[PDB]
């Protein structure tokens, strides 16, 4: 997250921190996620497409810090890693960039809700806020494009939803942005998602409810004029999500 503020898990109790273990015993941070039901985290396929081995992954919930323990945090293995079959990437765009991680504690259980671990609601079919609406993002992603390490403390910021019309102009993204995507940016280009933020939530307060409007997907750089963050339009993927989450 370029700009914005540091935060704690209690402010974003649905955010999942997803790591990869390596041969040798090192663990790295992969991407964020959102808890959508006690057994299911939802994230981005491009985070996992090169390494689809569910065994390699660790999911934390209730976690505020990158490399240390937070009180009340829970550790999960990935029982089922489900990638969208029509995923693909172009120069810039990722398409159908959505994934489900079915989770389980070492004792065989799904998430137990607490003050620091809660689910985030899904939107209804083709039901998004109007452009100009403020929404929040959360992540351990880079704080500046030049960094090579991620922040140790979770972050958030508030960005504004951008119309498809503005997003698909030539100097923005042309036809690279589709209807199954959503753009959001700072009007002054000062805050943004950035590498490492992928897979995490774009949350919009919709009709008196905290709603998973987006999943961090792609962009051209971070906080660049005329280059908004691009997010998966979760409201266009409910038959996909329901289909894989029923069993
Ligand atoms: C086309 C590359 O896609 C990919 C692909 Cl295909 C793979 C990866 N990662 C591979 C290593 C393990 C984590 C996933 C990672 C990216 N993207 C980025 O590094 C990235 C992501 C975002 C969200 C960014 O911010 C844009 C939002 N304004 C930036 C600048 C880079």
CB 34, CB 117: distance < 8 Å: no
CA 40 to CA 43: how far, in whole Å?
Answer: 10
Tokens 């990869």: give the residue.
Answer: 20
CB 102, CB 108: distance < 8 Å: no
> Is 47 near ligand 1, meaning CB less than 6 Å away?
yes
**Residue 37 known to be catalytic:** no
CATH domain 1-12+120-235 topology: Thrombin, subunit H (2.40.10)
Of 207, 184, 198, the closest CA to residue 122 belongs to 207
Return the domain boundaries, the chain. 1-12+120-235, 13-119+236-247
For residue 200, what is the DSSP state?
-
Taking CA atoms, 170 is separated from 21, 84, 186, 226, 227, in Å, by 41, 29, 19, 10, 11
CA 156 to CA 140: how far, in whole Å?
Answer: 9
Q: How far apart are the first and last CA of the chain?
A: 34
Helix (H) or strand (E) holding 202: strand 201-205
> Is 142 near ligand 1, meaning CB less than 6 Å away?
no
How many C-beta atoms lie closer than 10 Å to residue 33's C-beta?
29
CA 154 to CA 196: how far, in whole Å?
Answer: 11
Taking CA atoms, 119 is separated from 14, 39, 50, 86, 113, in Å, by 5, 10, 28, 27, 8
Taking CA atoms, 194 is separated from 117, 146, 156, 222, in Å, by 24, 11, 12, 5
Q: What residue spans of the chain are helical by DSSP H?
A: 164-167, 238-245
Structure tokens at 81: 């890693």
Burial environment of residue 229 by CB neighbours within 10 A (0 to 12, 13 to 18, 19 or more)? buried
> Is 221 near ligand 1, meaning CB less than 6 Å away?
yes
CA 129 to CA 244: how far, in whole Å?
Answer: 26
Which resolution, in Å, applies to this structure?
2.0
Tokens 């590498």: give the residue.
Answer: 195
CA 148 to CA 195: how far, in whole Å?
Answer: 10
Structure tokens at 100: 């489900």
For residue 234, what is the DSSP state?
G
Looking from the CA of residue 228, the nearest atom of ligand 1 is 28
Q: Which of 34, 46, 186, 235 is catalytic?
A: 46
For residue 227, what is the DSSP state?
B
**Residue 97 known to be catalytic:** yes
Approach to solving: X-ray
Helix (H) or strand (E) holding 229: strand 229-233
CA 117 to CA 119: how far, in whole Å?
Answer: 7
**Residue 90 known to be catalytic:** no
3-state secondary structure of 216: strand
For atom 4 of ligand 1, the residue with the nearest CA is: 46
Does domain 13-119+236-247 correspond to CATH entry 3.20.20.210? no
**Three-state SS letters, 117-176:** ECCCECCCCCCCCCCCCEEEEEECCCCCCCCCCCCCECEEEEEEEECHHHHCCCCCCHHH
* Intrachain domains 1-12+120-235 and 13-119+236-247 with the same fold: yes
């Amino acid at each position: 997250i370029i700009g914005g503020e540091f935060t704690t898990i209690e402010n974003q109790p649905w955010f999942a921190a997803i790591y990869r273990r390596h041969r040798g015993g090192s663990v790295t941070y992969v991407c964020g996620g959102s808890l959508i039901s006690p057994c299911w985290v939802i994230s981005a396929t491009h985070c996992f497409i090169d390494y689809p081995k569910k065994e390699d992954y660790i999911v934390y919930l209730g976690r505020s810090r990158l490399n240390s323990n937070t009180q009340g945090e829970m550790k999960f293995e990935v029982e089922n890693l489900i990638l969208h079959k029509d995923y693909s990437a172009d120069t810039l765009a990722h398409h159908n960039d959505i994934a489900l991680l079915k989770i389980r504690s070492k004792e065989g259980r799904c998430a137990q809700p607490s003050r620091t671990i809660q689910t985030i609601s899904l939107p209804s079919m083709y039901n998004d806020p109007q452009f100009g609406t403020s929404c929040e993002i959360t992540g351990f992603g880079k704080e500046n494009s030049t960094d090579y390490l991620y922040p140790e403390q979770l972050k958030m910021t508030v960005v504004k939803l951008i119309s498809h019309r503005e997003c698909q102009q030539p100097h923005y993204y042309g036809s690279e942005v589709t209807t199954k995507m959503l753009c959001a940016a700072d009007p002054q280009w000062k805050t943004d998602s950035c590498q490492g933020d992928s897979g995490g939530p774009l949350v919009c307060s919709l009709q008196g409810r905290m709603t998973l409007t987006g999943i961090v997907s792609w962009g051209r750089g971070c906080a660049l004029k005329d280059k908004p963050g691009v997010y998966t339009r979760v409201s266009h993927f409910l038959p996909w999500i329901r289909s894989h989450t029923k069993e």
